[PDB]
Design a protein around this ligand. Structure first.
Ligand SMILES: *[C@@H]1O[C@H](CO)[C@@H](O[C@@H]2O[C@H](CO)[C@@H](O[C@@H]3O[C@H](CO[C@H]4O[C@H](CO)[C@@H](O)[C@H](O[C@H]5O[C@H](CO)[C@@H](O)[C@H](O)[C@@H]5O)[C@@H]4O)[C@@H](O)[C@H](O[C@H]4O[C@H](CO)[C@@H](O)[C@H](O)[C@@H]4O[C@H]4O[C@H](CO)[C@@H](O)[C@H](O)[C@@H]4O)[C@@H]3O)[C@H](O)[C@H]2NC(C)=O)[C@H](O)[C@H]1NC(C)=O
Ligand SMILES: *[C@@H]1O[C@H](CO)[C@@H](O[C@@H]2O[C@H](CO)[C@@H](O)[C@H](O)[C@H]2NC(C)=O)[C@H](O)[C@H]1NC(C)=O
Ligand SMILES: *[C@@H]1O[C@H](CO)[C@@H](O[C@@H]2O[C@H](CO)[C@@H](O)[C@H](O)[C@H]2NC(C)=O)[C@H](O)[C@H]1NC(C)=O
Ligand SMILES: *[C@@H]1O[C@H](CO)[C@@H](O[C@@H]2O[C@H](CO)[C@@H](O)[C@H](O)[C@H]2NC(C)=O)[C@H](O)[C@H]1NC(C)=O
Ligand code: NAG
Lengths: 50, 105, 128
């Protein structure tokens, strides 16, 4: 996940060329994280050990 | 310092002097002059014992909900000064109480 | 939980204001402690709070001229305030603090902030 709410800001840089940057962030400044279980990853590594 | 006038029996809506960015935890205080302040709401809905159920606040469900103290069935004992003490995730430590609301019915 | 304070009432400018608050009923180890000021015509101003291991953080607005101290030998909360001004002529209240922790994200990432809630208060004493 990327659990912080970001707004897309369109910046004019040329004729037809539109630069889409990150606008004002609202909500909570939170880190992007991934939950790779713990129980399945225990048995996966053990079968990697064998 | 902000006057608000409501009639008897109505639901009083006290808005905070500061607005919400991000997740919040708002504390509400009642301050009669010459009397001790009393805790009404902590963690944005929890009401300690001794506070009647007339006093209520909005829960923190998602973003955009304005922090408002609800006084249903206002009595003569609610004449005081009401405080919104706000914490949030981006302004850091909230050293100041913010603006004070002078309530007179 | 009852808190009863007592102060000197009047000092000359740049002297130390010392108020002594007696706390009775419960143990000292279970709560955080604080001091509250209320200027006349203005709001409530925090002046600081004390921790269990004698660590105090002060207001950037007050420019760190306030010292909050603690003496557990006689079961009381202490205060000292030097470099006083006529703007410090105010009503002082004593209270305790409960450190609340509102989680909004992952705990292991430090995605949380601490807040304090004040449940019991003193009666207030006026010094000039
Ligand atoms: C990858 O894994 C990590 C690890 O789990 C995940 O990180 C988690 O992220 C979530 C984000 O939502 C965190 O949830 C938050 O938890 C807060 C604390 O919850 C604990 O305390 C409360 C109150 O004491 C208890 O009720 C909770 O118990 C409940 O949840 C557990 C979860 O299993 C159940 O088992 C229980 O049975 C209960 O059901 C916890 O003990 C929690 O307060 C917070 O929810 C509030 O905040 C959100 C956002 O502001 C609001 O939308 C929401 O409505 C809640 O607001 C109410 O509660 C607050 C309480 O202060 C009030 O003030 C409000 O007014 C309102 O009433 C939120 O849910 C979770 O803690 C965290 N895990 C860890 C270990 O830290 C990642 O998400 C995950 N990623 C992916 C992609 O999966
Ligand atoms: C990023 O910096 C810009 C600098 O221009 C900020 O934009 C202004 O911010 C001030 C607040 O100091 C506002 O009063 C203006 O209205 C803003 N102007 C515009 C055009 O947005 C912007 O707010 C900053 N963003 C973040 C997230 O800090
Ligand atoms: C990843 O998230 C998904 C949900 O998007 C989880 O999958 C479901 O989880 C619920 C409750 O946890 C179960 O009732 C469903 O049966 C699950 N569905 C499937 C298809 O598995 C999943 O458990 C999450 N995994 C981790 C490691 O967090
Ligand atoms: C993520 O950001 C978008 C855009 O800033 C939010 O959409 C707005 O939400 C507010 C209320 O928070 C509404 O008043 C606006 O009308 C919405 N605008 C649009 C274009 O949808 C969105 O709610 C945010 N989501 C979260 C979870 O914070
Ligand atoms: C991981 O697996 C081993 C062997 O299967 C087990 O002894 C251990 O308790 C497991 N740990 C966790 C955290 O599940």
């Amino acid at each position: 996940t990327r659990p912080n709410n970001n707004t897309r800001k369109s910046v004019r840089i040329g004729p037809g060329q539109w630069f889409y940057a990150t606008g004002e962030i609202i909500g909570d400044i939170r880190e992007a994280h991934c939950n790779i279980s713990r129980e399945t990853w225990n048995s996966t590594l053990i079968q990697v050990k064998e | 310092v902000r006057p608000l006038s409501v009639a008897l029996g109505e639901t009083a809506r006290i808005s905070c002097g500061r607005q919400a960015l991000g997740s919040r935890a708002v504390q509400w205080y009642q301050h009669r002059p010459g009397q001790a302040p009393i805790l009404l709401i902590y963690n944005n809905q929890d009401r300690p014992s001794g506070i009647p159920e007339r006093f209520s606040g909005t829960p923190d469900i998602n973003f955009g909900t304005r922090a408002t103290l609800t006084i249903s069935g206002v009595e003569a004992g609610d004449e005081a000064d009401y405080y919104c003490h706000m914490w949030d995730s981006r302004s850091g430590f909230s050293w100041s109480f913010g603006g004070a609301t002078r309530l007179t019915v | 939980v009852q808190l009863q304070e007592s102060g000197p009432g009047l000092v000359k400018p740049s002297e130390t204001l010392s108020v002594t608050c007696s706390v009775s009923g419960d143990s000292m180890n279970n709560y955080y402690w604080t001091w509250i000021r209320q200027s006349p015509g203005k709001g409530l101003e925090w002046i600081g709070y004390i921790s269990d291991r004698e660590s105090a953080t002060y207001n950037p607005s007050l420019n760190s001229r306030v010292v909050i101290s603690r003496d557990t030998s006689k079961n009381q909360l202490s205060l000292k305030l030097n470099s006083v001004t006529p703007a410090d002529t105010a009503v002082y209240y004593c209270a305790t603090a409960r450190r609340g922790q509102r989680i909004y994200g992952v705990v292991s990432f430090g995605e949380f902030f601490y807040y304090y809630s004040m449940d019991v208060w003193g009666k207030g004493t006026t010094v000039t």
